[PDB]
């Protein structure tokens, strides 16, 4: 299950976290995740185990022991835990809670306590880690994007348009582009000054994309740094060209007649390694595999009783 070359995980309000086999749509194993919905799934760079960020806890089941139950729980933190991110070298983990804190977790040690805390006014919706492992990007509900220097502990903030909560933020593998998506439905792109190693690492605004009319729920760069994906409450994942910042492929689950009242929000997405494919999480209880280029629904992973909010995807050797 962590032994198959392609890990695909799906979670939501149905108290399970389900694992699928990429190329067929057949569900491998399912694990019990009761007492909470699942807010975020992320598979550790180590391919050993997956993380389920929930309500006041982060449960972590194992991809290797192919059976049991949560290896580690992390408790003693009130309100939801919204984002999870790991640091390449095994033992680091990050979270942004509704408790307005960004927390650094030592994985190779005991304590429900965390090695560090960064605290802001307003809940933290997303946390992502600059490729250089040295800076953390933190976006909160007030609309501020924080750069936390993991060495200098130097808080440095930046609000774009916001008096609007920024929803997710991502930064491309090449460290050339950072993107943040907000609840208005906008997508902001910056150019990265690669200060690094004796650091400066600055942000120069490049574009605002009118990505969506409704809540924009997540954004993600393809491994390529070719494309940028935008998931939204308008039941749509929009894939944009980094060269033009023009729309390339739109994916949607919008009924087929105005009198349907939607059914399904496009909660999350995850590109394939080769950046050829994209996976999709929806409230209509299904994950979806799309061809990035044709926008073709190549598979439909149906199984969850209640909604899906969570994806995890892995492509490593």
């Amino acid at each position: 299950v962590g032994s198959d070359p392609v890990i695909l995980a799906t979670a939501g309000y149905d108290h399970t976290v389900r694992f699928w086999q990429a190329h067929s749509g057949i569900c491998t194993r399912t694990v019990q995740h009761q007492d909470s919905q699942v807010n975020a799934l992320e598979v550790t760079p180590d391919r050993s185990m997956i993380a389920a960020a929930g309500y006041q806890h982060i449960r972590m089941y194992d991809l290797n022991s192919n059976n049991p139950n949560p290896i580690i729980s992390y408790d003693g933190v009130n309100k939801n835990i919204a984002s999870v991110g790991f640091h390449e070298d095994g033992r680091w983990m990050y979270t942004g809670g509704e408790d307005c804190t960004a927390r650094i977790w030592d994985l190779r040690s005991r304590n429900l306590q965390c090695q560090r805390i960064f605290q802001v006014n307003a809940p933290i919706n997303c946390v992502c880690l600059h490729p250089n492992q040295a800076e953390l990007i933190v976006g909160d509900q007030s609309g501020a994007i924080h750069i936390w220097d993991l060495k200098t502990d130097h808080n440095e903030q930046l609000i774009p348009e916001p008096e609007v909560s920024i929803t997710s933020a991502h930064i491309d593998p090449d460290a050339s582009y950072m993107a943040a998506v907000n609840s208005t439905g906008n997508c902001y792109v910056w150019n990265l000054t690669g200060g690094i190693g004796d650091e400066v690492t600055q942000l120069i605004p490049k574009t605002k994309i009118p990505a969506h009319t409704r809540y924009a729920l997540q954004c993600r760069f393809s491994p390529d740094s070719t494309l940028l994906a935008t998931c939204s409450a308008d039941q749509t994942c929009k894939i944009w060209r980094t060269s033009n910042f023009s729309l390339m492929t739109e994916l949607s689950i919008k009924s087929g007649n105005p009198g349907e009242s939607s059914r399904g929000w496009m909660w999350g997405c995850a590109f394939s390694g080769d950046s050829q494919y994209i996976v999709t999480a929806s409230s209509d209880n299904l994950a979806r595999l799309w061809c990035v280029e044709t926008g073709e629904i190549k598979r439909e992973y149906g199984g969850h009783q209640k909604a899906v909010v969570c994806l995890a995807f892995n492509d490593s050797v």
Binding site: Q37, N39, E98, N125, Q141, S183, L217
Partner: protein
């Protein structure tokens, strides 16, 4: 026939709106403003235009929207932009002109007519003439008028009218006489041609009909010399009385202008200019006064103002202030007063007393303004304080009477007091200090008191603010002899009446430890006992049964004192209130809660010292022996068990066992199960078992709880209804019902365990807000009020509540509709749980979806739809809506100021007969609801979806919002009276408990709450730094009350989907 014509229009509007429901089109939108116009509903329709704008910029030209929005001044400079950017465009001129003729800009209208006369367009030639005729009429030039009148057809009412004016100038009387009647019949047949679907031209026909009969008095004022007083009187009365927006009155005076020059009318034109300034047409008002002055729009700007007409100058002065130039205004005032006092002292040769007097009163108005403005320019500090006090005292001198003068002076002293106090607490944060402070405060406290006293006597029946303020100084100054004498003087001086407004505040301070303070209270309270007891007993009765000794003690003296004077009334009231508290929580009912509590402390907390405290009074309570049949029938079935259950408890106290103690709980769980069974069997109480004393009561002299007011014949309890329905609830309240000695029936709600004293003060605040609303003309125009009810506390536990007739809770009205239409009551709820089982724990983002999803799969009609099915007609239906919307908007704004939380569907109800809304239960006041730990409110007032629906479509745009700023306007104006009341029960000694519930000294906490209230009354509620004007604040608020983000967080019982 006439009452039958509006009926069809109302019924068509229903379907017309339900069509707009189906698809919002400009087609319907047209046939909607129009039909609402016929229904002479002006503002509701105006809301149709707000929507028309916000979704269709499509009858185009932002100058056409500004013109239809009667914003002439906005449409003018929009048309200037539109004409100078574009070309000639025949239509763009006609609009540019209409703006002028409404603004009364005859200067430009006449010019724009002549200076542009190519007008090859012949329709452009036809309208043209009507406008330039009046323009010339406004500018004297009768030649131009006649020229342009010769172009108006005699077929038009207009053509026949302007002939009547030109005749009357050249003195051709029987010409004008006939011109009047022709134009009448040309307009009579014209109000039948545009039969219903016309402009404010059936409302502006009253402008023409007025003008025509007035023009017939202008006739009367030409040949026969003997109505020069009679005509001027009616002209004058039907003016201060009459209410027609600026623009009509211009024309109206222009008719009177043929007959009387402004310099003989003066008072008339000043009154008119007065309205132009208040309504916000200063540029116009200025021109009125410049004429009246006979001197410059002070183009000679560095020059002194002319004292020629002392009255006119004063107006110009305050127009200049209200205008931009306000440092310039203040300067001309200082000098004006200096000139005025010299024009008095020296220029008064005795046989000139009237002029001296009117001169002296105008002066007092000046000093008032001088102080007002100094405060405005500099604020309150060590340099301004004595200067404005100097100004106010001076105003006090020159008018002696006049409420405002004395008031202003009191507040100044009282804010002088406050300034130093708040500077000294500022000092203390970082012995000769206290002594100078003592002398400082004593210097300002005594005038403050005195002033407030002479102000109150000048207010009579309208002094609540001042009266409370007297109390702040009284209560707040642990009394120094100097202050006390001033108080004693006032007490003797001012009427007894006054204090009734204030009785609960007074009683909150009976047990005052400050000895000089206490005496006066007691003595005054007894005097208030001498004239109108009744107004005293109920409250005093509560106080005289009070755990706190000094309270009940001092209360009993006053009652004793009242017996030497009104004994049986004291005795009657004594017993009635006693009996009623027995009926509120019955023996077994007290036992049940007591047994629940005792099982929590012991079995679930290991606390026997708390548990014993729970049970011991219940045992002592019955130790007194049964007193009613209901008390004995409990005593039989349960008494022996309990009396021996306490026996085991008291074997353990001395033994310290646990087997002694478990025998007790063995017995305790027995009766509990028995009572729990009989509990849903309490659906009625018969008086003859429960309280025979109350069944006995016949033709008492005690007045029906909360009916007594002087002015009004005392309504007494002539009998009590023998059965009290038990409203089956968690607190099972009683539907006590009483018989009036006037015949009518009075219903109450006997509440067992809720401290009702808060709701009293809330109802008190309301009364004031009602007054204020009745006193603002606009609010009075639209019948804006708070549906209030009687609240009579009976202890800390119990009390009575006035039962408004014809009212069902929102919740009830829905539960019926839903069961009648076969909808599962809690359908939205069930939808949500099916989708997200862990709803209460989702992220905001996730919650908003679950919520939205539930809304999109349910009818928002319900409320709207059942109020249409209820209505017997359609006009009835319409008014019930107009009522509902307005009344709700009122308590949206007031509710906000009071910080009124917990507005769930069983806490507001609707009067099924008028439609006016009604709020009950005022526990969660001030931000409390929002401050709580679990499930904090994010809402200012419920503006929930089925409420909105039930209004007119284009709801919040129409009546709701207008009514919102209208109410909010009043509140900010009267921000101080409103703050007096609120301050009075935030710092009320006994009521401070509702703020220490932030846990599940106070001095600091209380201050915040009150600032928070001021913030809300000074547009600083949102951002600290900005000072939002009303409509913005309003807009911001409606936004906050509507945010799905806010509503999805509301605890499920609040029904954020109803």
């Amino acid at each position: 026939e006439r009452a039958a014509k509006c009926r069809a229009y109302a019924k068509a509007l229903h379907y017309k709106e339900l069509e707009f429901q189906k698809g919002p089109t400009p087609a319907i939108l047209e046939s909607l403003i129009s039909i609402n116009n016929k229904l002479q509903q002006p503002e509701a329709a105006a809301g149709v235009l707000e929507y028309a704008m916000k979704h269709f910029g499509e009858l185009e030209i932002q100058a056409t929207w500004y013109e239809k929005l009667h914003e002439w001044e906005d449409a003018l400079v929009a048309y200037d932009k539109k004409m100078d950017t574009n070309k000639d465009d025949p239509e763009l001129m006609l609009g540019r002109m209409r703006c002028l003729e409404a603004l009364g800009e005859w200067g430009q209208l006449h010019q724009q007519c002549c200076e542009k006369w190519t007008l090859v367009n012949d329709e452009t030639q036809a309208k043209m003439a009507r406008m330039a005729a009046a323009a010339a009429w406004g500018l004297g030039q009768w030649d131009s008028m006649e020229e342009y009148t010769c172009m108006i057809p005699r077929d038009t009412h207009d053509g026949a009218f302007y002939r009547a004016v030109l005749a009357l100038h050249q003195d051709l009387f029987s010409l004008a006489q006939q011109c009047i009647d022709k134009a009448r019949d040309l307009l009579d047949a014209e109000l039948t041609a545009m039969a219903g679907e016309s402009y404010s031209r059936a409302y502006g026909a009253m402008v023409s009909c007025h003008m025509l009969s007035e023009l017939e008095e202008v006739i009367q004022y030409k040949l026969v010399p003997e109505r020069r007083e009679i005509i001027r009187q009616i002209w004058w009365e039907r003016l201060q009385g009459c209410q027609r927006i600026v623009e009509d009155w211009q024309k109206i005076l222009m008719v009177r202008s043929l007959v009387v020059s402004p310099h003989e009318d003066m008072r008339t034109w000043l009154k008119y200019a007065s309205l132009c300034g208040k309504s916000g047409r200063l540029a116009l008002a200025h021109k009125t006064l410049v004429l009246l002055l006979g001197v410059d729009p002070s183009r000679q700007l560095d020059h002194p103002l002319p004292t020629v007409h002392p009255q006119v100058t004063y107006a110009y002065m305050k127009n200049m202030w209200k205008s931009a130039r306000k440092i310039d205004a203040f300067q001309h005032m200082q000098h004006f007063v200096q000139t005025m006092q010299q024009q008095a002292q020296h220029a008064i040769a005795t046989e000139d007393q009237q002029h001296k007097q009117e001169l002296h009163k105008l002066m007092a108005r000046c000093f008032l303004k001088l102080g007002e403005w100094q405060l405005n320019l500099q604020g309150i500090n060590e340099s301004t304080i004595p200067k404005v006090l100097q100004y106010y005292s001076a105003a006090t001198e020159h008018d002696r009477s006049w409420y405002k003068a004395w008031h202003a002076w009191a507040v100044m002293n009282f804010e002088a007091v406050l300034h130093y106090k708040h500077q000294n607490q500022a000092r203390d944060e970082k012995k000769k200090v206290t002594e100078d402070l003592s002398k400082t405060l004593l210097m300002y406290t005594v005038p403050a008191v005195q002033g407030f006293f002479r102000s109150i006597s000048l207010s009579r029946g309208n002094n609540l603010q001042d009266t409370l303020r007297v109390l702040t100084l009284w209560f707040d100054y642990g009394h120094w002899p100097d202050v006390n004498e001033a108080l004693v003087e006032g007490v003797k001086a001012i009427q007894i009446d006054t204090w009734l407004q204030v009785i609960p505040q007074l009683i909150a301070r009976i047990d005052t430890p400050r000895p000089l303070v206490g005496r006066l209270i007691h003595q005054l309270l007894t005097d208030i006992g001498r004239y109108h007891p009744q107004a005293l007993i109920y409250p005093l009765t509560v106080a005289s049964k009070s755990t706190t000794t000094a309270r009940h003690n001092a209360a009993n003296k006053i009652l004793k004192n009242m017996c030497e004077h009104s004994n049986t009334l004291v005795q009657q009231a004594m017993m009635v209130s006693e009996e009623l508290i027995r009926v509120a929580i019955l023996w077994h009912e007290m036992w049940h809660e007591g047994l629940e509590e005792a099982s929590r402390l012991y079995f679930g907390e290991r606390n026997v010292k708390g548990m014993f405290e729970v049970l011991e009074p219940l045992h002592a309570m019955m130790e007194r022996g049964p007193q009613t049949l209901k008390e004995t029938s409990f005593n039989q079935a349960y008494g022996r068990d309990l009396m021996e259950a306490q026996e085991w408890c008291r074997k353990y106290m001395k033994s310290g066992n646990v087997k002694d103690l478990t025998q007790a709980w063995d017995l305790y769980y027995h009766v509990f199960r028995r009572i729990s069974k009989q509990l849903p069997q309490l659906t009625s109480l018969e008086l003859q078992y429960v309280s025979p004393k109350l069944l006995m009561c016949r033709d008492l002299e005690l007045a029906v709880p909360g009916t007594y007011d002087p002015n009004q014949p005392i309504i007494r309890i002539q009998s009590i209804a023998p059965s009290l329905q038990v409203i089956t609830s968690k607190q099972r309240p009683r539907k006590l019902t009483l018989m009036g000695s006037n015949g009518h029936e009075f219903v109450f709600l006997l509440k067992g365990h809720e401290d009702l004293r808060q709701d009293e003060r809330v109802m008190q605040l309301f009364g004031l807000v009602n007054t204020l609303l009745a006193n603002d003309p606009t609010s009075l125009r639209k019948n804006l009020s708070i549906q209030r009810y009687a609240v009579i506390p009976l202890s800390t536990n119990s009390g009575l509540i006035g039962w408004v007739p014809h009212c069902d809770t929102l919740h009830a009205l829905i539960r019926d509709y839903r069961e009648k239409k076969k909808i599962l009551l809690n359908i939205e709820h069930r939808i949500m749980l099916r989708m997200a089982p862990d709803y209460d724990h989702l992220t905001l983002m996730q919650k908003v979806e679950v919520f939205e999803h539930a809304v999109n799969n349910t009818a928002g009609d319900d409320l709207a739809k059942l109020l249409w099915l209820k209505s017997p007609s359609s006009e009835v239906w319409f008014d019930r809506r107009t009522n509902y919307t307005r009344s709700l908007a009122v308590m949206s704004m007031v509710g906000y100021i009071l910080g009124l939380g917990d507005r769930h569907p069983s806490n507001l109800m609707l009067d099924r007969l008028s439609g006016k809304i009604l709020h009950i239960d005022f526990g969660d006041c001030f931000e409390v609801a929002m401050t709580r730990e679990k499930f904090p409110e994010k809402i200012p007032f419920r503006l929930t979806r089925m409420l909105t629906n039930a209004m007119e479509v284009t709801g919040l745009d129409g009546n709701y919002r207008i009514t919102c700023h209208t109410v909010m306007e009043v509140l900010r104006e009267h921000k101080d009276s409103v703050m007096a009341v609120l301050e009075a029960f935030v710092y009320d000694p006994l009521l401070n408990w509702r703020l220490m519930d932030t846990n599940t000294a106070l001095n600091k906490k209380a201050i915040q709450i009150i600032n928070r209230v001021r913030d809300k009354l000074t547009g600083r509620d949102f951002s600290h730094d900005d000072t939002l004007d009303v409509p913005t604040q309003v807009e911001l608020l409606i936004k906050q009350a509507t945010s799905h983000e806010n509503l999805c967080q509301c605890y499920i019982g609040w029904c954020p989907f109803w």
